[PDB]
């Protein structure tokens, strides 16, 4: 249910809205996910 | 939906091309939790016990005792709601704007509506990072003419009940000066049980130009920024020591550490831009659209920041 | 205004020191309690929380009530208030209390007698000695560590 | 002093007449409404509600809010008040309101249908100069203090 | 030198990295809160009235009524755009309240400001309140946050 899945289809606007809640936080995960700090 | 309405389709073709939030650099993964709510407030309870006075002498007979008092605390996070309007170019107006290497009226500014999203979104992004900075909302550089928030909207620099230092205006340039003030503020951190976490230093572009020099007759292989690492490790138990600089903060250094037990961010799911099902409609090629955002929910224990204010005259 | 502050606290409290962690206007009860107390309750008139109360008479209709005040009036003093049902709990001045009070806006071992709105003042027909100096804890409200022993002689 | 009372109630309403049940303080907005009306909302300062309002400016850190004023100041009529937020929602003097707003404690018995009505320093309506309000009905007490009066403002006069 | 946007062309790139104090230009059109309830009408422009007081202006009679700078008594609304290939300036009536920035004389908030011969806003009719300083354009062009709210003695 977000909207990175390609074979997603929002019937609607409130599902659209949940779509793109799930994309922010899909995105903030792989952003925690890949970031590495400097240390030093 | 796609099919119906071109301007879903839009965002969601459009949306991948906004660059994620700089406050993610701040927060550990584990200091940020969702929650579902757009407009109102969340609570939470604390208990507290303390010594009312020197224990009682139990020898031979005693019946007024010396006591232990209780006490509860109420906290609560309060979040907001905002919009903004934002005007743009009809779809079946598009065609007759379109130009060589550009679409839309440069003699009136006027644009596509992906790329006013687009545009809209960053701006919108940018004000709600600096609101997560500085605990404020506001348009102009002084500052002034800020929008009134409700209560218990607190942003990192703006939290009460933190430790507070600031640095003469005639040692503005001393770093030496400045050091003698982060370690007394280092010194008044309280900590407690969570201390061995890693820590994190914010600081304007001015103080990290003057960090980067050599500690000091100046010493070899020894800058003052190793000395601040140093000096942090001392009390967060030798954990990871980040320092970051942000253009939005000036003459400020904050000190916090990155553990979820003592700073939370709760922000709401739909904080984050988000467009709305409205859009005004005219006989001419002139469109509104409009998007909300959701600000609020940082939640932070007392005296477990720093705040290192130098200055300037 | 309230023994529970009505705004809720922004931040989450600190708990990890153990000293001076006392001087709140909620620490209902007193420093030193005993098991052989004698404790009433009364229905509230105002809001005589932490002073010297005195009985209050209407017309009749109900119940007598006890309101702030002091003087040649006193008849105990209040240590902790239920909100809900507006009861105020009384210790009476012929038991000795010893604990926290409001004080009228000092040195260990002054003087002290009720004033007309149950405060504490220094110094007459009441026995009461600060144990401490006043706590600020607003611009306007000041508390005091003070031993209530019964009344004196004139 | 509220939208809707502080203290609650001990009684169920009966929900059986359909004739003068409209005279409430929680009445807001305006009886006739009209799609195309241009609504503002404001910070509140104090409790303008059922009031006229006026801006208010502070030392320059803040925006601007909206206080209970009128006479020369006034700029719009204050119809409905979220108290979560402190947000006042205000109609603008140039565009027509008809509505419950609240009367001076003063004379209300001489309130009458058709009589001219003028808004005071207090944001409270008064029997008359320049704004064009008129009484479409007489005085109804809410409380000993609390007099409401439907009245339709249509702009200023000369 | 007047136009709403600047005939010469710019030298460098703008840096888009700042988010603050960059709506104070004279291409800003419109107002800064605009409901979707507001009535505009476009008209005739004679002269160059953007971004002030018009007031309608008759001519013989072969040639239909047309919109030129002025205030006064003779006020009709205000412009607040203008479209130069057509000559058309969009006015909101004097009736419709109006919040956006407007041309000032060559002042603190809370001012009253009344429209002059030139259309420009000058210190006490009242016809605005001054939200804001002016703001300084040019050396003869200044601007103001004006809320607009018909006409009241």
């Known amino acids: 249910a977000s909207l990175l899945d390609s074979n997603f289809v929002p019937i609607n606007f409130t599902e659209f809205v949940q779509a793109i809640s799930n994309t922010y936080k899909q995105r903030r995960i792989q952003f925690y996910e890949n970031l590495k700090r400097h240390k030093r | 939906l796609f099919d119906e309405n071109y301007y879903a389709k839009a965002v969601a073709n459009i949306i991948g091309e906004v660059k994620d939030p700089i406050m993610y650099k701040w927060f550990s993964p584990d200091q940020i939790e969702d929650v579902d709510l757009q407009m109102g407030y969340q609570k939470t309870v604390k208990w507290d016990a303390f010594l009312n006075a020197n224990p009682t002498t139990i020898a031979n007979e005693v019946n007024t005792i010396s006591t232990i008092g209780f006490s ?17 170019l009809k779809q079946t107006s598009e065609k007759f ?11 009136n500014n006027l644009l596509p509506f992906a790329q006013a999203y687009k545009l809209a979104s960053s701006e919108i992004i940018k004000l709600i990072n600096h609101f997560v900075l500085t605990g404020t909302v506001s348009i102009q550089k002084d500052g002034k003419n800020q929008k009134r928030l409700l209560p218990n909207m607190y942003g990192l620099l ?11 205006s005639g040692d503005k340039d001393k770093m030496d000066k400045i050091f003698e003030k982060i370690e007394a503020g ?12 890693p820590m994190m230093v914010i600081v304007d572009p001015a103080t990290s130009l003057k960090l980067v020099k050599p500690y000091a007759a100046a010493s070899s292989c020894e800058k ?19 320092i970051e600089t942000s253009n939005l903060l000036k003459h400020k250094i904050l000190i916090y550490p990155l553990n979820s037990e003592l700073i939370k961010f709760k922000p709401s799911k739909y904080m984050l831009p988000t467009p709305n099902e409205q859009v005004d409609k ?18 932070a224990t007392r005296k477990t920041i720093l705040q290192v204010n130098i200055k300037q005259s | 205004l309230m023994k529970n502050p009505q705004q809720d606290s922004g931040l989450l409290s600190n708990s990890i020191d153990f000293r001076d962690q006392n001087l709140i206007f909620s620490n209902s009860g007193g420093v030193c309690t005993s098991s052989k107390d004698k404790i009433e309750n009364y229905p ?8 010297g109360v005195k009985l209050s008479f209407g017309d009749g209709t109900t119940e007598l009530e006890v309101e702030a005040g002091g003087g040649d009036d006193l008849y105990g003093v209040c240590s902790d208030i239920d909100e809900f049902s507006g009861m105020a709990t009384v210790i009476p001045i012929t038991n000795n209390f010893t604990g926290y009070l409001t004080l009228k806006k000092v040195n260990p071992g002054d003087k002290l007698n009720f004033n007309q709105h149950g405060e504490l003042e220094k110094v007459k027909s009441v026995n009461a000695i600060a144990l401490s100096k006043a706590h600020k804890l607003t611009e ?3 508390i005091v560590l003070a031993s209530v022993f019964g009344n004196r002689a004139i």
Do not use: C
């Open chain 2, 72 to 88: 509860s605390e109420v906290v609560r996070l309060n979040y907001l709601k905002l919009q903004y309007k934002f005007r743009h």
């Open chain 2, 224 to 242: 003052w920024e190793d000395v601040l690492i140093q000096t942090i490790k001392a009390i967060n138990n030798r954990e990871d020591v980040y």
């Open chain 2, 97 to 107: 704007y379109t130009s060589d290497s550009y679409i839309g009226d440069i003699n």
């Open chain 2, 282 to 299: 005219d006989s001419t090629d002139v469109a509104h659209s409009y998007i909300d955002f959701v600000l609020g929910g940082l939640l």
């Open chain 2, 158 to 168: 703006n939290m009460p009940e933190q430790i507070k230092e600031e640095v003469a």
């Open chain 3, 44 to 51: 509230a008139k105002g809001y005589p929380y932490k002073r």
């Open chain 3, 140 to 142: 306007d409200l000041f």
């Open chain 2, 186 to 197: 280092l010194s008044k951190l309280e900590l407690g049980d969570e201390f061995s976490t």
